[PDB]
């Protein structure tokens, strides 16, 4: 009884509320951080007011601050910036490469990894580590709860579940990576109000893309200069790729030479 | 008598030798650093080694380490990764938004920023401020002395830019400074650390006309989304065009401009 992907995504997203916890940091330390509210020019910056006019929104809420954003803030006199507090993500691992991969994935995507390291196969130990993680963390990821769903149409990573602020993820690296990009990433963004975290590009396929109806497929690709090389394939598939093509459940596949969308890592 | 951009750029890159100084850092801290050397697998990781086989290069020198790159290193048992020691980049300024803009830009592009603050437009004070930065840094940026290999190029904005002896003489205008960083400093930093694949060109259909002129290498700020590029209307003291963009288009000087509806290359910030 697999939950179609888009459906599953909406469940997880509808079950999470943007965190309203604001905190203030010096400009230097604001790079990469998510702007907690609109910034309104309090004065003006060639009959001037060209840059930004008093009362206009200089930067919007959920802006992932870049070097030029810091530059603007400075020009507006803002010494300390209001930024969202990083969602703490507990990382539990059951039995080891996922611990560091997920730690880095969550750092790259607005979160604060919290590493509970490994937990052996004992439903007791697992349960405590997990309940511990649930108390300490805004969101928890455990590798293989009242699950709003378990088992999905994604490939790989079908067995994924989400319930009560926790994702039950796979144990295979590429499946963990797929699960993060198709689920966790979007969850982390809604929690912090991040805007423009994904870049979609047009690419022409250098290869065929074998798929199958009924599966939402995550395909790894090396995207370069308007072209995508499908990585035939096992961590090497992720290292040899820099982007991903999705093949929905009603698309049987794609043919060498046609144009599609890939999303950059 | 202006230097043409590409001629100018290869002058800077060819005068810079890759730093071969390495440091070993734990995996937890290796994210985004540049792998200093090819890593060959000591192990085998559906047949054995399908992932990586003994004696093969698992990761190439120059790789900007990503979450999965670190995961492969753990699999290979490399608790301490040989990474390049960040080039140190002195920032001298002659209020000021360039200090913090450049500092983040260098941070974003492989270097370690070192602030020397503002110095009076006093020639003596500039000379010693420079000399101090040359002693401590692999590269120096002065906004606002030097045996320059060129001074003034075809680029717009940021035309007066000069380079010589590890120092870029940069503009005082935010948009010119940003322009000069992406067209020159970013590349000089990459050459120094030996970074591979540090930029992404994408195809975009223009939502607007891109007016330019022959004789000038134009840096055009754009907002790229969903196969489309929106041209930002606005060096230049107006940093709002920098923030309302996420990519840039180059108009290479033997091109008068581009028209609405035409497809082009834009480079993501």
Show the helix and strand layout.
Two copies of one chain form a homodimer.
Chain A lengths: L4 H10 L7 E5 L12 E2 L16 E3 L7 H9 L4 E5 L3 E7 L3 H11 L3 E8 L3 H14 L2 E5 L5 E2 L3 E2 L5 E3 L2 E4 L3 H20 L7 E6 L3 E2 L5 E9 L2 E4 L5 H4 L3 E5 L5 E2 L4 E6 L1
Parallel strand pairs in A: 5-6, 5-7, 7-11, 9-14, 12-15
Antiparallel strand pairs in A: 1-4, 2-3, 8-10, 10-11, 12-18, 13-17, 14-15, 14-16, 16-18
Helix pairs in contact in A: 3-5
PDB class: structural genomics, unknown function
Keywords: Structural genomics, Molybdenum cofactor biosynthesis protein, Pyrococcus furiosus, Southeast Collaboratory for Structural Genomics, hyperthermophile, PSI, Protein Structure Initiative, secsg, unknown function
Assembly: dimeric
Properties at a glance:
265 residues, 6-stranded mixed beta sheet, globular, homodimer, alpha/beta, 5-stranded mixed beta barrel, Molybdenum Cofactor Biosythetic Enzyme, Chain A, Beta-clip, 26% helix
Written description of the protein model:
The first copy, chain A, is of the alpha/beta class. The first copy, chain A, folds into two domains: 1-19 and 86-192, Molybdenum Cofactor Biosythetic Enzyme, Chain A, CATH 3.40.980; 193-265, MoeA, C-terminal, domain IV (Beta-clip, Beta Barrel), CATH 2.40.340. Helices cover 26% and strands 30% of the residues of chain A. Chain A is built from six helices and 18 strands. The first copy, chain A, has helices at 5-14, 67-75, 98-108, 123-136, 173-192, 236-239; strands at 22-26, 39-40, 57-59, 80-84, 88-94, 112-119, 139-143, 149-150, 154-155, 161-163, 166-169, 200-205, 209-210, 216-224, 227-230, 243-247, 253-254, 259-264. In chain A, β14 (216-224) and β15 (227-230) form a beta hairpin. The two termini of chain A are 30 Å apart.
């Amino acid at each position: 009884r697999l939950t179609p992907y888009e459906e599953a995504l909406s469940i997880v997203l509808n079950d999470l509320k943007e965190i309203e916890e604001v905190e203030y940091v010096p400009l230097k330390d604001a790079l990469g951080r998510v702007l907690a509210e609109d910034i309104v020019a309090s004065y003006d910056l060639s009959f001037a007011g060209e840059d930004v006019k008093k009362g206009d929104i200089a930067l919007k809420k959920g802006t992932i601050l870049r070097p030029q954003d810091l530059a603007l803030l400075k020009a507006l006199g803002i010494r300390k910036v209001p930024v969202k507090v990083k969602p703490k993500v507990g990382i539990i691992i059951t039995g080891d490469t996922n611990s560091i991969m997920l730690s880095a994935l969550v750092e790259r995507y607005f979160g604060e990894p919290i590493l509970y390291g490994v937990v052996p196969d004992n439903e007791d130990l697992i349960r405590s580590a997990l309940e511990k993680a649930k108390r300490e963390c805004d969101l928890v990821l455990i590798t293989g709860v009242n699950l709003l769903f378990h088992g999905t149409t994604i490939r790989p990573g079908r067995p994924i579940g989400y319930g009560e602020r926790v994702f039950v993820m796979s144990g295979y690296p590429v499946a963990v990576f797929t699960q993060f990009h198709l689920f966790v990433k979007h969850a982390l963004a809604k929690l912090v109000g991040a805007k423009d975290y994904e870049v979609k590009v047009r690419a022409v396929l250098e290869d065929d893309v074998p798929s199958q109806l009924g599966r939402y497929e995550f395909v790894r690709v090396m995207y370069r200069d308007g072209k995508a090389k499908v990585i035939k394939k096992i961590i090497s598939s992720l290292v040899q790729s820099n982007a991903y093509l999705v093949v929905p459940e009603d698309v049987e596949g794609y043919r060498r030479g046609e144009e599609v969308w890939v999303t950059l890592y």
